[PDB]
Amino acid sequence: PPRLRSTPQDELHDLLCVGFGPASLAIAIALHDALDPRLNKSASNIAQPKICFLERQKQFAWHSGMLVPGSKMQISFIKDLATLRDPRSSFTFLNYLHQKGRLIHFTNLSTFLPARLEFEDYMRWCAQQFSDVVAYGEEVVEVIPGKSDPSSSVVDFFTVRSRNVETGEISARRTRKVVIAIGGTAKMPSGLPQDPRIIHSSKYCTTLPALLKDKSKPYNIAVLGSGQSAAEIFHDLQKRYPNSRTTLIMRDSAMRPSDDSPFVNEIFNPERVDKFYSQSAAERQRSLLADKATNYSVVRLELIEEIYNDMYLQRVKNPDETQWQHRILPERKITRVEHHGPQSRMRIHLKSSKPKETLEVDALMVATGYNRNAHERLLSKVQHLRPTGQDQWKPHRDYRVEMDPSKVSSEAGIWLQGCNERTHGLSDSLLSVLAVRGGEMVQSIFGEQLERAA
Amino acid sequence: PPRLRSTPQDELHDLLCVGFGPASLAIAIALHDALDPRLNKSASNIAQPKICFLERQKQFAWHSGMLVPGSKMQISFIKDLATLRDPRSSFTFLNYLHQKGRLIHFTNLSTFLPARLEFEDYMRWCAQQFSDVVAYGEEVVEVIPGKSDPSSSVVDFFTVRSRNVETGEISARRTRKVVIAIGGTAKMPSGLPQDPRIIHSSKYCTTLPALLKDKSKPYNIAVLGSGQSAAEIFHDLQKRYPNSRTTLIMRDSAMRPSDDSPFVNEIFNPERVDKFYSQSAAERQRSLLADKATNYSVVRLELIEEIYNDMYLQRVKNPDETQWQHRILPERKITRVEHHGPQSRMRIHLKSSKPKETLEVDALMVATGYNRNAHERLLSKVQHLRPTGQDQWKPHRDYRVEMDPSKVSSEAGIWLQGCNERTHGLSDSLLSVLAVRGGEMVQSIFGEQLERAA
Amino acid sequence: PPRLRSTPQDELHDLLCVGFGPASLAIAIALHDALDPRLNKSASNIAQPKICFLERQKQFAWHSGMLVPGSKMQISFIKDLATLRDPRSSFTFLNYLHQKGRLIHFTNLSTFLPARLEFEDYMRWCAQQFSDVVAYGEEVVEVIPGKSDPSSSVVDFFTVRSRNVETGEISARRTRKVVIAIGGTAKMPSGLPQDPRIIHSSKYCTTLPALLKDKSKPYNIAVLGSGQSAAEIFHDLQKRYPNSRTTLIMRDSAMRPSDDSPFVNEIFNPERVDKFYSQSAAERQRSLLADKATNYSVVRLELIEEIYNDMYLQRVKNPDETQWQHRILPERKITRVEHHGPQSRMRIHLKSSKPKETLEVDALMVATGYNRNAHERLLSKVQHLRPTGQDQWKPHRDYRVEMDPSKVSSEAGIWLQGCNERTHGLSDSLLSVLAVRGGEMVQSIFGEQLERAA
Amino acid sequence: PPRLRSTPQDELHDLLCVGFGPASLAIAIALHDALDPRLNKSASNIAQPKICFLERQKQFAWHSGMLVPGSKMQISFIKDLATLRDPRSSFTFLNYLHQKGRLIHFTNLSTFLPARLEFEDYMRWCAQQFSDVVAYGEEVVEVIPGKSDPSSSVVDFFTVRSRNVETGEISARRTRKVVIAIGGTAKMPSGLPQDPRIIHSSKYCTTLPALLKDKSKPYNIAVLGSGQSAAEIFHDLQKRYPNSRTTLIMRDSAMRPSDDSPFVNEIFNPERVDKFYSQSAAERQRSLLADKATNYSVVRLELIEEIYNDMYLQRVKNPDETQWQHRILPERKITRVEHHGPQSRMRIHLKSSKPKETLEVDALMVATGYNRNAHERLLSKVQHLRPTGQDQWKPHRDYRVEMDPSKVSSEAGIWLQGCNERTHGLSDSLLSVLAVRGGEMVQSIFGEQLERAA
């Protein structure tokens, strides 16, 4: 039973991981498993690797701003952080349930889709077992190249600088290898102005109740978007604020269901990463477009049906749609936001989305998705180590970015996780392949040491 | 297009119906249909029958105390008040939806089970078309035999006395024929005492909010029973009073699902009334017991699953069941109720139901079903017209009760509706056969007149 | 109760309909209903219109080549040929079931989706009531303009010439107004050669058993396509020929589910035809593309799941996919068909569909859809009556094609049905709006006469 | 990684298990797991126990006579032979799928209910890992008491005699402890005569095709019963013999659905065995009756719906039920079977089951369940070791039968498995608690040795 011990800050690490979300957690789990002589017989002959995870949050949390009450996983629990790699792992969802005394009780639900609350707790339970090698409240701000021989022209380590979120102090740690697994940042439409009453979906549960404190007051609340987050928020607002008037604004004509049909869904199989990666740029782009309805701007059928039913019940009570407490406004775009008025309410102007009315609202929830380019800011000072004229980070199949072999030692490298959809497929940003990917990553990074034991 | 005109109070009626609930409404609809030359070609040759319906409520309503938000019909909309007799009828659910401008919208729900709110409105829409022949706010208090020749020993009419619910005045109407369609009365366990805080399920929506006025207060509310009403209330309380502590008390070990499987469910077919009626007393009793799970002490599967899921989510948050906000207490019976205390809360003592704890609650909802014997109080003064030594009303196949042929003229009679489960089957008290039964009833009562036209 | 009587062949008709499929049948039903004084009170004052339907089949049939055993409707039974226009109509699906003694039995299925076999019989039952005004075994071959004054330059009638399918004789009928409701013709890929062993899906049930007579023989049968017809055939072959080796060839990567989600599905509402028609050419094209997954190249989820399950069971028995009895070959196109060999089997050559193997098969089923341009062949001799320079038939909102007002009298006209997707929407070729459309069509064609009664 | 080695026939065993079905297999798995130092840290200090399993079949098989094509498990795969005891076990269903290369593929089915074919293979894969300690083709015929000191009056071992199914030779093995896990024997109604054409459901797949060799011939085949086996066979016959005329005979009025609702289903939780066992004889009997619909004379809802649908399709084709190819004959009992006729068909006489027709059939399938009393025949010679006057085997909570402490040494004992419903609950004969029970059994039998290591 291996327990990963901490490395002193001042020592050269074998690996430093930026972020301790699901993607990094799955690597921590895979490494534990690779070192467990109960699962990997060769691990009897294997000194502990010097590893550290840096996480900006104060403790493990999973999209806490969107832990909407009643919200469910959109993925089978079998695709947890260990099972698809090894069902014998102690880090499986079912083993978690066993450890909690809930296994028989979950079984009686006959569901593959746990509440997001439950799956977060599963990952929290997993994450707590690595507390000795994780530094929370640490926001990585840059990765700097290092040379053990400064007079040479070869880079063989990296310095990772992080800011303490409480004290603001900068700490440095040196490592041979870096993983960047920082997820995404809130995507806001460029046309919207900054305002406390305009809030991205990622901050829904955490910041909206601070703005609208009275759950009984008749607030007007708009929601922009038509994907899963938009539908979840729109539906939740009606429960959370029973006397409110909610409006869903979308440029599309309707909410559309996610495609989870079994043949299409095979694009998410771990085996398929090889097939997707080995295609051309054009084929990968075309494939992404063809399968878009599996993940992007789509809503789970069950939720669409529930919302539609709520709308129909409003029709039963009142045939005049303009008098409905909760409304959906399709094929529309925001053209102007008035937010300097002495009123508590902003004034939102709407036009057709085809190439109209005015709304007075207390808050606008913006469910417009994420960008996954934040790693570029962290890596700006290592850009010069890329091969000449390359202005994009190119991840290999094993997620290690390409660098000039004559500038960077074979012992040093940087891996990207969760931002590689374009090269690795639609499963990249999701939970789908994390168990298997974690195992691949451990092989890629710690292969040499693991072979000496093997 | 026939429109039933009112009969003056002082005139001898052909028919007087006690109650204007679903059962009487289906008779009104069938009579309209029988007189509609568009549906019944013979009706061209057919004077209007002198008819009146007496209803104690101020206006049409359908189990208003149990119009729980979100509650659904447990029966296909095809089994409405007309369709199974004639799909061409203007009183079909689909024609109602067409008249309302909702037909296409309902179609898009892909559901056979409308909200109870919607189905009530359907029946209200139907009922409003008979407002000229219905006297609301009139509670029938007795049915008295009458003799057009008082010196004779033959009864040939009945006087129906009703009390105005507002003024308390007694009005009489004389009729040749009487229908009693008064549904059921609240069944309370004999062991429980009378108290404003102890309320039958039938009075849930109408009287509980008057008792517990603050929807935010942390009330303790118990629910007794394990049938559909108990589950509906238990589930609704958690929505209506978010900070409340609810407890479901049942003598059974678990909530059990209603059987709606297709072969068993055929007992509800209109054709099957003939088969059920023609069996012996023992066979009818045995059949009722064998099929009990179709109607009695059962909960719709979907609702059991929802409640169970809510319970599991409580387990996720807290593994200690005694700390759960909402609890179910199986295999238990109330033995004592303390309700004279200076406290606002009653003290409910519990023991095992096999041949324990104490609860402090602000209200006890009692979901213990209905009796259907209230017609006996109304008919006590006509009992002597039954054949000698008969101490039970015996309905024929056509629902007309047996009377001594030498005491009662062939032109006079009394019909029972909705209280005949023992002779007619499990569909008797339900909506299942009302369309067809209404048609049979019109034939039984108005056959002679309808034949002259035929 | 109106019964449409036949018009002698030699008389000038008010209307002549080409085709007696669902679209023409819905017009016949609407006309009956408009003339029924039981449904339309004004019809008491209304001489019978002189009408005739010409149908090339020997008797009413509905896609008989695709009456696959077990195949189901993809549309709610509420969207039958009358209900959405008038639920009181005797031509509703529910009234049909009542007339058949099956209403209670269908109700117990709890399904909105009847077997295609059942829905065909419903339409057959409807169609048989118009046998006096339908000429079967008559294939319309041309529509010719006529002038009651031949020296004038104004057209005021049309001659319809039809070929007797048995005798080959040409018959003519003259009418003021023509409806063309001829559905679609089999679409075959241009690259495939003509061969008795290459059969379009439309001829599956009728012609394939004549080719492959022994249901026990181990035939190799390929299926080309990935829409509903392809999946239905692929699945059925495995039942019909238990020892056969079936192959599904598709250029797409996977079978994709049809979108029947409630918000998107509203594009099929009758009310929406007005909204769709009133858009620009670009907006209509964009809208058609956006909603394509509702109808084109899609398979019902349930069927995809069944086929996938069958595939998984093959995996259980044998992990080597190349040995599977039934296989799916995605992302492939046929490049060559060898069919001159002394062998009973054709040789099908396959390549990637991205811009491989060889199959030896006894039959190739081609499920590649339909064209709806066959009306152009029938109307070639009336093209000159279109406004100058117009080389496309332009249907108005009411389906009447545009003609030069100075060449064609106001009393004469031609209507198109079922080929108008581009102007009227995705519901045009389907059953979705037929009841309502039939009513609109009767108003458009017989408005003048119906107003005199009104 | 422990591998159980064989014990020579002539050595005194620690344990001898009669039967190698699911129940014994779960004990073998639990013992392996208890000895696995990877799962049980104490097992590092633990000589191998001398164990042997005797199985009458030639190789592992699971109800092979009822491996009906398409038949599914009625239990969640989580309730496999290891998971509920330890999800880390290599004997879990998911680990089996991983070892087979099918884990991702099963995941994509979104089902908790594998095909019986698949679950048998899972158990076969498990069973093959114990081939060194299992003797197949050995039918145990008696258990005889033994005394290491024959002049003493204390029994301290047992001799198990088994017959080789091929050679007929009797072999003996001596053991301290015996487990009897022999499942059930076919229950036939006493009124039916012996005939090759009258076959119990347990022999359906294995022996019926030998009798009715021509799958195309129009055989008449009757099925008696109304539980899961009856429905499965009735449905399968229609597929297997497409031209046959099948009849389902039942004494009940209808097929009834199994209750798998979540609250009731908790009776199957492993924890609940303690609660059930600790009740009185009357309470246990009453509890068994109350929950009967979970297991006995019930059919999975989905299958009832399918069969009902098939019946409705027959109604569509022909409204005359007496002409239906496949029929159900409710509320009936067989009174006479004529089977001496020169005809190939037997003549079955039917009467009402309430306290009729004749059928001519080629075969009668009898789906009338199992008895679980066969252990009494094997134990007749050890009956005298029970406490005085005890004429029933009384299993303790830990499944060890009560014996006179002064006649039987503490080191010797006999355990019963799968025949203990009356004392242990409805989960006893099923797969529900096998993983946990296997663990309890290993503790009960090998506790002393396992503690020395602990």
Ligand SMILES: Cc1cc2nc3c(=O)[nH]c(=O)nc-3n(C[C@H](O)[C@H](O)[C@H](O)COP(=O)(O)OP(=O)(O)OC[C@H]3O[C@@H](n4cnc5c(N)ncnc54)[C@H](O)[C@@H]3O)c2cc1C
């Ligand atoms: C509301 C919601 C629901 C979802 N549901 C599902 C689902 O059901 N199934 C599914 O497959 N996928 C789902 N997803 C997709 C989601 O991306 C993955 O579940 C998962 O979060 C990916 O993990 P990650 O580690 O790549 O990114 P994240 O989960 O975002 O984790 C990245 C971590 O890095 C930390 N970090 C960021 N920047 C820094 C820095 N500079 N220094 C230090 N630490 C930093 C962040 O605090 C965060 O903890 C969902 C996404 C959202 C938003």
Ligand SMILES: Cc1cc2nc3c(=O)[nH]c(=O)nc-3n(C[C@H](O)[C@H](O)[C@H](O)COP(=O)(O)OP(=O)(O)OC[C@H]3O[C@@H](n4cnc5c(N)ncnc54)[C@H](O)[C@@H]3O)c2cc1C
């Ligand atoms: C909450 C609830 C939900 C149900 N849901 C369903 C369902 O989904 N499907 C189904 O098939 N069945 C259902 N039922 C069964 C129900 O009995 C029938 O739907 C229906 O109410 C039977 O109609 P009825 O006219 O016989 O009785 P009621 O509906 O009770 O109508 C009787 C009427 O008589 C009036 N009345 C009583 N006494 C007098 C008097 N002395 N003088 C004058 N008027 C009087 C009453 O005010 C009432 O209006 C439900 C029952 C309940 C309580």
Ligand SMILES: Cc1cc2nc3c(=O)[nH]c(=O)nc-3n(C[C@H](O)[C@H](O)[C@H](O)COP(=O)(O)OP(=O)(O)OC[C@H]3O[C@@H](n4cnc5c(N)ncnc54)[C@H](O)[C@@H]3O)c2cc1C
């Ligand atoms: C297998 C299949 C299943 C389908 N299922 C559904 C469904 O579930 N729901 C749905 O909404 N839609 C469905 N459709 C769409 C289908 O187009 C409509 O159901 C319907 O057939 C449209 O009717 P129509 O009259 O426009 O065309 P058709 O049904 O093709 O009828 C046209 C008629 O015109 C006749 N005809 C053609 N040419 C001539 C001529 N020269 N002279 C005389 N007569 C002629 C033909 O014989 C035919 O009877 C399905 C289509 C197919 C192929």
Ligand SMILES: Cc1cc2nc3c(=O)[nH]c(=O)nc-3n(C[C@H](O)[C@H](O)[C@H](O)COP(=O)(O)OP(=O)(O)OC[C@H]3O[C@@H](n4cnc5c(N)ncnc54)[C@H](O)[C@@H]3O)c2cc1C
């Ligand atoms: C068709 C069918 C389907 C079922 N499906 C399910 C399901 O989905 N879920 C569920 O929980 N339960 C199910 N059951 C219940 C079933 O009892 C259990 O799944 C399981 O078979 C119990 O295992 P067992 O070892 O107690 O008995 P068995 O499975 O009968 O095994 C007993 C073994 O002992 C052997 N044996 C018998 N006598 C002797 C002898 N004298 N000498 C040597 N060997 C002997 C037999 O050959 C057999 O291999 C099903 C039962 C049947 C019949």
Ligand SMILES: N[C@@H](CCCC[NH3+])C(=O)O
């Ligand atoms: N299942 C019954 C109705 C039961 C109603 C229970 N409240 C039917 O089909 O008519």
Ligand SMILES: N[C@@H](CCCC[NH3+])C(=O)O
């Ligand atoms: N429902 C039971 C299994 C019943 C099996 C019936 N053959 C369980 O969950 O364990």
